[PDB]
Point group: C4
Amino acid sequence: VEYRNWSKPQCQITGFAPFSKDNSIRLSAGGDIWVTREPYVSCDPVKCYQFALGQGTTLDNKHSNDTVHDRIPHRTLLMNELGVPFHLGTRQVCIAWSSSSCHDGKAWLHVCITGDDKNATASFIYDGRLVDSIGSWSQNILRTQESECVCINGTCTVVMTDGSASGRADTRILFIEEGKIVHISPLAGSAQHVEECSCYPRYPGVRCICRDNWKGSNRPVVDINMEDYSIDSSYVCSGLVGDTPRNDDRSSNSNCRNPNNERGTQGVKGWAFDNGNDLWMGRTISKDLRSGYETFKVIGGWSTPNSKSQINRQVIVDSDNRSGYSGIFSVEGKSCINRCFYVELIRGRKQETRVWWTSNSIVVFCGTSGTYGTGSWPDGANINFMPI
Amino acid sequence: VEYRNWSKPQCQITGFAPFSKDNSIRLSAGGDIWVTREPYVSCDPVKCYQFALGQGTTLDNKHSNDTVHDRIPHRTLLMNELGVPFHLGTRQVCIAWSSSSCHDGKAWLHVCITGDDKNATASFIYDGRLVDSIGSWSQNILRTQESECVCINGTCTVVMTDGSASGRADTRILFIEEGKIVHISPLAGSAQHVEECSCYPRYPGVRCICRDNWKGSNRPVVDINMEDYSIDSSYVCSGLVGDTPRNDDRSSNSNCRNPNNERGTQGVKGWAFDNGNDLWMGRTISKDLRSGYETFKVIGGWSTPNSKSQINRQVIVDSDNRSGYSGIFSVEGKSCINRCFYVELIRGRKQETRVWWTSNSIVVFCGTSGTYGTGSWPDGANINFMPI
Amino acid sequence: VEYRNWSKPQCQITGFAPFSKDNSIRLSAGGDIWVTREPYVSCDPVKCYQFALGQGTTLDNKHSNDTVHDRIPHRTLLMNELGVPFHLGTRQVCIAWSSSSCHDGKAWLHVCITGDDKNATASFIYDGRLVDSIGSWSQNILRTQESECVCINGTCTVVMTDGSASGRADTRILFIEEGKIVHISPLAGSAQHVEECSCYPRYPGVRCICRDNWKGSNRPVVDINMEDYSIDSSYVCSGLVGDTPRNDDRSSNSNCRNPNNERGTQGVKGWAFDNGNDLWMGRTISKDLRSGYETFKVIGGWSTPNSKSQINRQVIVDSDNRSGYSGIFSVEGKSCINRCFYVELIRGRKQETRVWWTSNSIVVFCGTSGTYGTGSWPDGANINFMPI
Amino acid sequence: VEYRNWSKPQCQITGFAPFSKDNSIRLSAGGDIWVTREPYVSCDPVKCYQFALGQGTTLDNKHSNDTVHDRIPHRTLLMNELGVPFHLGTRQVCIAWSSSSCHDGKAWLHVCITGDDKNATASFIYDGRLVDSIGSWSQNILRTQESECVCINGTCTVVMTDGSASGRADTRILFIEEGKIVHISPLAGSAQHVEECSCYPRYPGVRCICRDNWKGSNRPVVDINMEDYSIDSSYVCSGLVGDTPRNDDRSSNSNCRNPNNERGTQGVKGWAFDNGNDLWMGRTISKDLRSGYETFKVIGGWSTPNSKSQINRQVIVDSDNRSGYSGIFSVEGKSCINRCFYVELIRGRKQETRVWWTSNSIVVFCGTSGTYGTGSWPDGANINFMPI
Ligand SMILES: *[C@@H]1O[C@H](CO[C@H]2O[C@@H](C)[C@@H](O)[C@@H](O)[C@@H]2O)[C@@H](O[C@@H]2O[C@H](CO)[C@@H](O[C@@H]3O[C@H](CO)[C@@H](O)[C@H](O[C@H]4O[C@H](CO)[C@@H](O[C@@H]5O[C@H](CO)[C@@H](O[C@H]6O[C@H](CO)[C@H](OS(=O)(=O)O)[C@H](O)[C@H]6NC(C)=O)[C@H](O)[C@H]5NC(C)=O)[C@H](O)[C@@H]4O)[C@@H]3O)[C@H](O)[C@H]2NC(C)=O)[C@H](O)[C@H]1NC(C)=O
Ligand SMILES: *[C@@H]1O[C@H](CO)[C@@H](O[C@@H]2O[C@H](CO)[C@@H](O[C@@H]3O[C@H](CO[C@H]4O[C@H](CO)[C@@H](O)[C@H](O)[C@@H]4O)[C@@H](O)[C@H](O[C@H]4O[C@H](CO)[C@@H](O)[C@H](O)[C@@H]4O[C@H]4O[C@H](CO)[C@@H](O)[C@H](O)[C@@H]4O)[C@@H]3O)[C@H](O)[C@H]2NC(C)=O)[C@H](O)[C@H]1NC(C)=O
Ligand SMILES: *[C@@H]1O[C@H](CO)[C@@H](O[C@@H]2O[C@H](CO)[C@@H](O[C@@H]3O[C@H](CO[C@H]4O[C@H](CO)[C@@H](O)[C@H](O)[C@@H]4O)[C@@H](O)[C@H](O[C@H]4O[C@H](CO)[C@@H](O)[C@H](O)[C@@H]4O[C@H]4O[C@H](CO)[C@@H](O)[C@H](O)[C@@H]4O)[C@@H]3O)[C@H](O)[C@H]2NC(C)=O)[C@H](O)[C@H]1NC(C)=O
Ligand SMILES: *[C@@H]1O[C@H](CO)[C@@H](O[C@@H]2O[C@H](CO)[C@@H](O[C@@H]3O[C@H](CO[C@H]4O[C@H](CO)[C@@H](O)[C@H](O)[C@@H]4O)[C@@H](O)[C@H](O[C@H]4O[C@H](CO)[C@@H](O)[C@H](O)[C@@H]4O[C@H]4O[C@H](CO)[C@@H](O)[C@H](O)[C@@H]4O)[C@@H]3O)[C@H](O)[C@H]2NC(C)=O)[C@H](O)[C@H]1NC(C)=O
Ligand SMILES: *[C@@H]1O[C@H](CO)[C@@H](O[C@@H]2O[C@H](CO)[C@@H](O[C@@H]3O[C@H](CO[C@H]4O[C@H](CO)[C@@H](O)[C@H](O)[C@@H]4O)[C@@H](O)[C@H](O[C@H]4O[C@H](CO)[C@@H](O)[C@H](O)[C@@H]4O[C@H]4O[C@H](CO)[C@@H](O)[C@H](O)[C@@H]4O)[C@@H]3O)[C@H](O)[C@H]2NC(C)=O)[C@H](O)[C@H]1NC(C)=O
Ligand SMILES: CC(=O)N[C@H]1[C@H]([C@H](O)[C@H](O)CO)O[C@@](O)(C(=O)O)C[C@@H]1O
Ligand SMILES: CC(=O)N[C@H]1[C@H]([C@H](O)[C@H](O)CO)O[C@@](O)(C(=O)O)C[C@@H]1O
Ligand SMILES: CC(=O)N[C@H]1[C@H]([C@H](O)[C@H](O)CO)O[C@@](O)(C(=O)O)C[C@@H]1O
Ligand SMILES: CC(=O)N[C@H]1[C@H]([C@H](O)[C@H](O)CO)O[C@@](O)(C(=O)O)C[C@@H]1O
Ligand SMILES: *[C@@H]1O[C@H](CO)[C@@H](O)[C@H](O)[C@H]1NC(C)=O
Ligand SMILES: *[C@@H]1O[C@H](CO)[C@@H](O)[C@H](O)[C@H]1NC(C)=O
Ligand SMILES: [Ca+2]
Ligand SMILES: [Ca+2]
Ligand SMILES: [Ca+2]
Ligand SMILES: [Ca+2]
């Protein structure tokens, strides 16, 4: 067994093709299914696994009432082969209300965060053993990715932040070998706020598109040099802009360097990735609510301040259905490495009031160089049939 | 690990012996079992797996209401070891309302089709990764086998069609190596309509008996030359005729070359395979409804226009119980390769009105050169005990 | 991987020690558990599996009503690691209302019997593939062991009978290599009726203690010569006598050669095994009903006509609780091969009338050369808490 | 595969970091979860498994009524990967109302005890086979660890006791190779009563901190010489004292040699381990009830009679929530071997009267040399939502 070094060209893609859907909410109205949120999928070298933070309860269970809250001591990271839903025989890999897992070629790495908001501890579990831990540096909710970390040659890097949600915060990128933190680098460059990074191997680096929860509608870019541990950061040039709230494409802007200050506050985890000077990306279809999801290529989106020429758009969840968080994940192919993404469909409170729980389900698509058609693949549950 | 090349004689068979039954509908009245239809079983070199398209819900779940529909975005391909039923811990291998999976010696191939009827996309998942995709060529429901594809020396072939259901349609046979489409051949020869092929290794070719949904009660034969990618097609000579609707054996005909035009429209997936000049086959016992299932050898059935001398018949599901789709699957034996088949028993709407769901269960038999007796092995559920 | 040849001394045993209990009936009042009967456990070279014939339904399911019947088309052989109960994710290995499985060192062999009582077919599934089949020779319920077959050097032998239940019947011992029947030997020697053999490796032979359902309270002994395929048969000498109905030890007899004709008709599957001139055995504690279960050594029980000196008795299920079938299974130890047994605890109709189902649970003990104490380990379900 | 010899330094630890929580009671109000108590986790060389004694029933099942009792014939040892809860597909490894499992590098060892209180039998199951058994020496509840045994170079040692609960009792330490008892040593040194040892590898020995159920609030220390089979025993020096009932730190004492006689009677399984002259330990936060759980280092706690200087304390379950038994488990790390612990959170009767069952759930932490924060991770179930 050898370490993953990811040195293969990114595959050229034409757009995305359907890959998986687990249908957890339709099934919960006739089965015992875990209540979850912040899902993600990561992939070892032979097969793919889906993950999620559970709320320590199943949906048709009175303990699902008020699961809107993001942090309780009972949240654990659930892990299953991609496609098998979170039934009662699923494994709780660790205690966590914030996580990031990745496989380095030889074993899985899970960083799990639980604890008091003001004094959280992050555990680094590697190959089944606890190998290290870190406590909260700014005493205000130590958080992380909520999607995959990425390892090159034995070192896995994860980006975490502690500080204000909508204010200045402290961000450090950690480099860890076999579960042991081997270096910590503070954020550098121009990003003003960084939360939930969606990171991906871009040999010899790793690149992350994150959430700016303070001043931007455009998303931050964090660049990690795996050899010097140097960090660099900017914003995505695309004038099209992927966070929610966002302005609307007529009036939206990005200059590649600062927060655009257009409906800056709040956000949603998202992804985007480069292809030459172009950008492939997804965002919700609504500019105000987390509804619908669409992906497209922005010609010039990676390199020209404000480029808004779009092409190859695809609807993934129509605008009348709910979406949520989304992230990227890379699968190594035979000749190139491909990029795929998952989009969390959340259901329940606060937006839907008939029930007292909050849960999600997932749908995931992978890049393709072939051809494809059209569709909309939403959650599917009829809220009127659900246990409340 | 090496590629399956299937070069071994077909085993001589005497008839079929019982092999598996999963009992999914009896169990659904006291367990959480997936709602499914279009089942099939395929087999890797060490063990056999059963598959089916689920309706993204379990039976005792309000979302099972109106599952009569064949295509919704929530259908996924379910996969389990043959014999373990589709309980909540089953894996949804991909998104699909039409599929075909096969194992080439080294990994599984799944072609999954989802999307808009007018603009569907077929994904080629090989060894866990998405490796290729194709969009709809005639903009009218891209569909495929619904049973096993077959691979020889590394190339797997699947036959798909897009076009009218009962009208002229476009059929292409795709050759794919490691998930990547390496050639596409249009249908050739005399078949007029080809849907749902039941294909099997017949070294160095592959032969398929399909469904003619427009003008025939006799079934099409598609012959694929794995070396030139040439396609040839005809109809099965047997005057006995396996599609449903069918005429009745007194008045039924087939001339090996054209649709017989006897109750042509509509059909049901079926199988049949050759043995010298003889034909082994199964069809429903009713000539109008999908009820009962029987298998037999037709002396001369493969080679003489209209041969109707039957022998070795076996009832598999008596004529008072429901059957459905059926297909073939080959298992490599020690000295010869054997042929087996599965018969889908559907239950629910539209035929049975007490409940609002539609689901199936399966029973599967394998060829045998030994001896056997008689029986009838139907679904078994008492419709009056079912959740509605 | 090599073939099991069982050539190691039988371990000297002092009595039996507790080994497993699966608690299927207590659990069925709060879980979806398969309805089953005729359980048995067999063991491959690394681990042990428990088996049973299911009634194609779970207990809290309306289809469990009237499961008293021994043969319906929906019965399948269930198989799980010893100790995990038959939950909905269990595998139905084959269709069968009568079975026998064994592992020959390299793969499992399952002989499964389904079909019409007057024309049943037995399938020989080996290593996942159907490899052979046989039809009913006397047209009257082809039946077999209901416990483990045993293989030595590649050949597995099973004993089957077809004929009257309580009358003269036809018994053949089949020798099968890799799933293929390689020889069939008719019964020889003095046994008058042979049903349900409990067989065990006794290098270079196999010895079986069976059920005489016509004229005996003493149990038949069938001896198979694996090298000439010769069969020999007698009755167990012990005057103590293990079938139920039985007379009572004061008035019971056995002369090692003929049925004792003491409450001959009917019976129950049982086991017994030799140790020098002694006999280790188990029987129900009642001489009329299948209640309680006790094991003991009968000094001289193997060799002296009528020996009744008992020693080392152990109660396994007290006389106020229900028991059922019981059988033997051998596990190869490090220096000797040990003998273990399972005892089926049945519940439900006809004896208990509150519920309409019939099911069992199991408890299993293994030989030991150490020390042990006392106990009673019954089913445990309170019939008043059960779903009816 | 080679035998575990545990010869690596203990890792230096700073305190404990969160490791797993299975949430079995919240889940039981919406799923079929086993009723259990006396949990523990043990770990083979690649991964960790959690264990527990089940009460042969699930919680939402009428058979859970009155599960307060510690010994019934239906209790079995359950075993799963750490983190997957005891759902219906869990394996009952053996019959037992008292257990101890450990992995010696090459296979698991399970000592299981069932039987009559006055005449219990302990089975030694090794690598799937029963290999030995022992009967009760003092005819009064043969009991054992209820947490992991530990093996060095092929020999596993377990400590068992038979005798009075609160009175003089007989304790023997057994040494077993491959499931076979190879030597038995009676307790020696100064401990007066020894129950439930929490033992750990301390090359070349094994050290155990146990429960003194007769005369002490301070816990016994048992030292096993793996080379001479010599036993030595004392009490933990720490004046802080970990059993419950206990006096309170102002008035508590320990002189390293005798029971302190401060609220001696009764107890609770616990752990503690040495680090130079210091002691790491956990105890309940209440000195009277099993509520809350806290861990800390006692400077001088291992070597100075009565040392009470505490430092590094951590709350694990706040004082307003229930805790229970706790034990230690060692995981071999890359350069040193680490120590981890589990704390059983019990719920139900007798303390909580709304329901009629008694069950537990677990939370587990592992040592860490890094940093950490604060939290409280209790069971979580709202007793008013539970099935009764
Ligand atoms: C968890 O477990 C516990 C304990 O578990 C064990 O419990 C049982 C269930 C076992 O089976 C095990 O499986 C289990 O593990 C449970 O707790 C128990 O729950 C019981 C109820 O479920 C409760 O009540 C008991 O239950 C027993 C069986 O369930 C009964 O036998 C018992 O009563 C018996 O004796 C009674 C004597 O009076 C008798 O009463 C009859 O009724 C009338 C009442 O009006 C008597 O007299 C009146 O009669 C007429 C009118 O009809 C005249 O009226 S009038 O005055 O003129 O107007 C009479 O004059 C008047 N009498 C006067 C004035 O004196 C009548 O005479 C009686 N009949 C006779 C023939 O005597 C009754 O029929 C029974 O025979 C009682 O019901 C248990 O106490 C309770 N135990 C504990 C420790 O809690 C838990 O419930 C479960 N539950 C859960 C959820 O876990
Ligand atoms: C079957 O399935 C296939 C695959 O899904 C599908 O094809 C894809 O269709 C989409 C939708 O049309 C294509 O994406 C669009 O691409 C155009 C750009 O392409 C045109 O122009 C360039 C040069 O500019 C030419 O080279 C090219 O040949 C085309 O002529 C974009 O402009 C589209 O974006 C606009 O439209 C979206 C809605 O479709 C808006 O939401 C978006 O905001 C953009 O609108 C803005 O700009 C417009 C002017 O530029 C303006 O008019 C609006 O008001 C607004 O300001 C979109 O990206 C995609 O590329 C196709 N993919 C491929 C591989 O062919 C089939 O359509 C489908 N058919 C059916 C029946 O289902
Ligand atoms: C125990 O189990 C065994 C195995 O299942 C079973 O044996 C099988 O029985 C079936 C049913 O009889 C056999 O199949 C029939 O085969 C005949 C042909 O065989 C006869 O004729 C040939 C020469 O022609 C001889 O060589 C041979 O020895 C036989 O004499 C077919 O004719 C049968 O088909 C007709 O009957 C069917 C119903 O059985 C109809 O549904 C079908 O439509 C056919 O009918 C048409 O033709 C008839 C004249 O040809 C006419 O009379 C009708 O009106 C109609 O027009 C059928 O294929 C099978 O081969 C046996 N298998 C083996 C290996 O022996 C036992 O019967 C079973 N016994 C019991 C008690 O359960
Ligand atoms: C703790 O746990 C241990 C292990 O379970 C247990 O020890 C076992 O006890 C049983 C029950 O006593 C023992 O089995 C009995 O063995 C005697 C024979 O042994 C005696 O005699 C021989 C010579 O004959 C001596 O060598 C030997 O030392 C003994 O003195 C059998 O006779 C017993 O069978 C009779 O009793 C049964 C009930 O116990 C009846 O059901 C059975 O039908 C037999 O009765 C018939 O014969 C009797 C005269 O022979 C007559 O009196 C009756 O009316 C009837 O006609 C039985 O097999 C077993 O060997 C012990 N095992 C070991 C390894 O020691 C402890 O007893 C247990 N203690 C407690 C308190 O739980
Ligand atoms: C964020 O998370 C971190 C990690 O959890 C946490 O840090 C830890 O805090 C705890 C609680 O304070 C620390 O443990 C205490 O340690 C002191 C000893 O340390 C002091 O004194 C020594 C020399 O004596 C100095 O070297 C050292 O620098 C400190 O000044 C203990 O005394 C504490 O025990 C007493 O307090 C407990 C409650 O905290 C009592 O329950 C216990 O019974 C002890 O009380 C008794 O003695 C007292 C006098 O000694 C007396 O006043 C009482 O009345 C009573 O008689 C305790 O062990 C731990 O070491 C810290 N860990 C690390 C790695 O730093 C942060 O506090 C946390 N912050 C927030 C906001 O959440
Ligand atoms: C650790 C934690 O609470 N993370 C939460 C984050 C933070 O609130 C934002 O990043 C602001 O910092 O976002 C969510 O609330 C959200 O957008 O739905 C969900 C997530 O659980
Ligand atoms: C992709 C799709 O809809 N396939 C469906 C096909 C087509 O309708 C026919 O092939 C006509 O083209 O047949 C069914 O309707 C049927 O016979 O029960 C089921 C199946 O789901
Ligand atoms: C194949 C079959 O029906 N086997 C059944 C046998 C036969 O009836 C007897 O062997 C008489 O032949 O015994 C049972 O009825 C019984 O004793 O409970 C159960 C079993 O299912
Ligand atoms: C074998 C057995 O009954 N063990 C039990 C022990 C003993 O009672 C004590 O060790 C006194 O000997 O402790 C418990 O009761 C307890 O503390 O909750 C639980 C456990 O099941
Ligand atoms: C088919 O494969 C087998 C097994 O690898 C090989 O021995 C045989 O020669 C091959 N035959 C052909 C015609 O490819
Ligand atoms: C312990 O085991 C390791 C791994 O096999 C070995 O290298 C080491 O030398 C052993 N040490 C002792 C003291 O047995
Ligand atoms: Ca924002
Ligand atoms: Ca037709
Ligand atoms: Ca009899
Ligand atoms: Ca005490």
